[PDB]
Amino acid sequence: MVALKGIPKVLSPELLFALARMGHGDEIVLADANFPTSSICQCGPVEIRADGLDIPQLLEAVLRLLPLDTYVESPAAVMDLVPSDKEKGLQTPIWKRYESLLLEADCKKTLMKLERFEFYERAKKAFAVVATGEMALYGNIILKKGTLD
Amino acid sequence: MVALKGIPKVLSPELLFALARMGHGDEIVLADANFPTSSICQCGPVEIRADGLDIPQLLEAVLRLLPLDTYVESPAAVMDLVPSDKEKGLQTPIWKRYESLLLEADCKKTLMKLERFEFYERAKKAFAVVATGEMALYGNIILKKGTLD
Ligand SMILES: C[C@@H]1O[C@@H](O)[C@@H](O)[C@H](O)[C@@H]1O
Numbered sequence A, B: 001m002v003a004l005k006g007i008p009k010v011l012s013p014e015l016l017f018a019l020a021r022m023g024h025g026d027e028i029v030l031a032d033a034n035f036p037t038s039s040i041c042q043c044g045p046v047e048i049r050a051d052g053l054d055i056p057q058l059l060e061a062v063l064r065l066l067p068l069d070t071y072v073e074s075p076a077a078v079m080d081l082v083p084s085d086k087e088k089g090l091q092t093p094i095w096k097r098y099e100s101l102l103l104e105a106d107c108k109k110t111l112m113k114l115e116r117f118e119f120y121e122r123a124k125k126a127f128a129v130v131a132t133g134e135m136a137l138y139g140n141i142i143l144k145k146g147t148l149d
């Protein structure tokens, strides 16, 4: 991790580098432990490792530096449950934490829910994919960078 | 240029990456236009280009993020005038700007002035050298990263 004034300690230099290189409209994926990171990163995005971190910690740190797009219906998206899981009535409480962290970063929008394969399509066009140690089911979240001022 | 909350826009992603990778005690050189950056970098330090910027502007931006070493007599050093120049009574006003920027970053120490070849020896062991477009004579400055606790 990095040691610079005003920069969250949990950010690695490679992640900071990725955030700095991203432009307006670019997206970054914070992937859970079960995400097919290896295959997705074969299609374009840079792979960044964050093995010992959970997503809530990382998300909070990223939002301290990353301005979110305010012109899209929602600058943050998660993967919606697959049919089997919806039928089973699966609960995904981690999403409540995401909504809370976004609010604290001044983002009043609600998370967008994308169908599995539609989520995978977006991930392939992402600038980078951060492989975390998040074990929560459906913990993946995609963020879209906006402009400053 | 970088577009991230709280980060000076004049820093390039490569420079930010270097600053994040440096550890306690590591040094970085902000070199003027007449510094032998190419030869010095052949000896170890990474070369980062910032040709369109002068040092005062870059120094201020760097000081906003980089903590300076405290257990050393002085964490900043410039190159002292060679016998020839000190014989012409050559002035070096930019140093006053450096002292001022350092003070504003809460560094009360005075600049350490190193003999030309001593300076080169230090530069060769530096983590990186930033080639700027600074035209001021003897504008080179070395900064030693401290700890953030
Ligand atoms: C069915 C989904 O498959 C991948 O997208 C995982 O990352 C999710 O957490 C979930 O298990």
Ligand SMILES: C[C@@H]1O[C@@H](O)[C@@H](O)[C@H](O)[C@@H]1O
Pocket: B032, B033, B034, B035, B036, B079, B082, B136, B137, B138, B139, B140
């Ligand atoms: C004598 C010195 O030579 C190089 O180190 C230049 O970068 C300095 O500015 C000075 O001219």
